[PDB]
């Protein structure tokens, strides 16, 4: 079922014409979590079913759009326009196996289109019932968006980071740790004229619930003081990634620096520990300040990494889950041999269904494949 869905989705997206005239012609779809120009809504019938412990309809597929994503933009409109072709294959899949549970396509733009149609979840409309669901952060999405990694979070705890930016750094580190799974290994270090571990681990750990809790509790107790020294910190980070005496993953050695700014590039350390660019370096500039952000971007660009800015709590959610786009380039380039179904851990369904396991298969973009034009 997953393979057929992925094939149909790729074929439909390949032959699609971009447009910006959604005012004249509207996209018709049923939206969940409800009850604007360019969109028409659908009123379902919502019969009651015995398999799903709620009311569902077998005539169209519901769409969930997160709160911060406005459903009137042209990207979302095009997404709905070209994803409206998955309903027929959804119906065929459910007709083949009537015992089929939820089928879902989670887009990279934020919206998740699932079948059968059913209203989103709510708990008595209490004030503490805001919908913060984001399909791009669900583990069944992250496990198929990339491969296991060997992340080592390097945190700036120098004196120039005390204040709002230190709190932002702590929150960002917690949200970054929230994206990891059991197959990934992580450790957290800090540096202020001296690099040291933030907890009792001293090396990479399997990053399960207990270890992640320990790391979060250790990172929520750090203080800012002393001068900054990027050379010692990066030496420590590269040394901890060359252990091989412990259990590891050996799949993605990445260094995720959290800082504000500086004037040090430290070319010698990078030319010493990775001449062959075997370790990616992602860089984050956190808070509102007036420090130079040049060397940070140079570090992000020289190594096959990326550079991000997190100026407020609002951007933490989105600007900490974007590194999976960079880590997915080799998988896309491999292409056909990377179309393998993966099954995830046991977790509680967000639509009140119990304990479930989710199959996973990514979908590639193949527009202009027979002409080899863009490839960007």
């Amino acid at each position: 079922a997953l393979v057929r869905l992925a094939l149909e989705a790729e074929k439909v997206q390949a032959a699609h014409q971009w447009r910006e005239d959604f005012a004249s012609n509207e996209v018709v779809y049923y939206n969940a979590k409800d009850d604007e120009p360019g969109s028409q809504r659908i009123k379902p019938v919502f019969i009651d079913d015995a398999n799903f412990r709620r009311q569902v309809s077998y005539q169209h597929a519901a769409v969930h759009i997160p709160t911060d994503i406005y459903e009137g933009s042209t990207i979302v409109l095009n997404e709905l326009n070209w994803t409206s072709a998955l309903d027929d294959v959804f119906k065929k899949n459910r007709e083949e196996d009537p015992s089929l549970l939820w089928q879902v396509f989670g887009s990279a733009t934020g919206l998740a289109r699932y079948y059968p149609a059913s209203p989103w979840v709510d708990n008595s409309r209490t004030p503490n019932k805001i919908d913060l669901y984001d399909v791009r952060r669900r583990p069944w999405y992250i496990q198929g968006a990339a491969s296991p990694k060997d992340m080592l979070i390097l945190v700036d705890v120098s004196g120039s980071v005390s204040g709002l930016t230190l709190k932002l750094i702590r929150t960002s580190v917690s949200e970054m740790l929230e994206t990891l799974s059991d197959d990934d290994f992580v450790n957290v270090a800090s540096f202020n004229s001296n690099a040291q571990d933030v907890s009792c681990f001293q090396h990479l750990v399997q990053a399960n619930v207990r270890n992640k809790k320990v790391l979060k509790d250790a990172v929520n107790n750090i203080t800012a003081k002393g001068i900054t020294d990027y050379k010692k910190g990066f030496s420590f980070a590269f040394e901890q990634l060359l252990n091989y005496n412990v259990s590891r993953a050996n799949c993605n050695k990445i260094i995720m620096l959290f800082t504000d700014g500086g004037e040090e590039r430290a070319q010698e350390i990078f030319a010493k520990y990775n001449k062959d660019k075997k370790v990616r370096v992602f860089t984050f500039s956190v808070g509102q300040h007036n420090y130079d952000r040049g060397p940070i971007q140079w570090m992000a660009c020289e190594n096959k990494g990326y550079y991000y800015e997190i100026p407020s709590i609002g951007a933490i959610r989105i600007n900490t889950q974007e590194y999976l786009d960079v880590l997915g380039r080799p998988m896309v380039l491999a292409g056909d041999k990377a179309k393998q179904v993966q099954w995830t851990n046991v977790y509680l369904d967000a639509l009140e269904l119990g304990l479930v396991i989710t199959g996973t298969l990514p979908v590639f973009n193949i527009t202009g494949q027979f002409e080899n034009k863009t490839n960007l």
């Binding site: 491969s147 660019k277 971007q297 992000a300 991000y308 800015e309 380039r329 080799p330 380039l333």
Partner: peptide
């Protein structure tokens, strides 16, 4: 798991987050 995908030589990686703004 044994299957790992990383470090493909055809990767562009010319679009970091700094030089593009």
């Amino acid at each position: 798991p044994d299957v790992c995908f990383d470090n493909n030589v055809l990767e562009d990686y010319t679009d970091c987050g700094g030089v593009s703004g």
